[model samples]
Target: SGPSSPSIDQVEPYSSTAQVQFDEPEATVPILKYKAEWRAVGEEVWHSKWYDAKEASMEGIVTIVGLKPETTYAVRLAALNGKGLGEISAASEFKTQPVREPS
Candidate 1:
């Protein structure tokens, strides 16, 4: 069976990371997976990236490196199991990295 889809929110302050959590769905021990994608403030394509977790509940440490400072990014997560992939959670987005002065 499919699990109750998860939701992604709270992309912390001055950071390029977010937290994703979901309710366990019906199944014979369903294992959940997560991934996130983001686009620049005025960019189009959303680059996809997978997290370093393959368990039931994520540690809420979604991080993305090599990002531009003082820019906006959009993030989304997906949960899946033996049955198949679940509905994608609503896109949780935020702006990050305040503009810093040159050294």
Candidate 2:
């Protein structure tokens, strides 16, 4: 059995980082981890990384860093478990806050 598409709960964008929150999706097979993919809006190249379930979600929270401040980016997540890679979440667009005094 394979996992199903995971749903993103919320995304928080900061000056140089974005935090993603999602709940575990329906799955017969235990999800091993989550895959996070992101890229600047309209760009072809995407940066991806693997986060072990434990590291990825203590409470379904994952933080992606090193994003350019004030830039809009497209982000999505998928789950890999058993033999099938689940469908990806709809592309979520978010823009980081401009660099300034801490909010």
Residue-level lDDT of model 2, residues 74-93, one tens digit each, is 88888888786778777787
The estimated TM-scores of all candidates read 0.67, 0.85
CA lDDT scores, all candidates in order: 0.59, 0.81
Q: Runs in model 2 with CA error above 4 Å? A: 26-28
Give the per-residue lDDT digits (tens) of candidate 1, residues 1-103: 5444556545663544434343334445454555666777788898876654354354544566667667777767666566666666677777776755679
In terms of lDDT, the poorest run of 10 residues in model 2 is 22-31
Between which residue pairs do clashes occur in model 1?
Answer: 3-25
Compared with the true structure, the alpha-carbon lDDT of candidate 1 equals 0.59
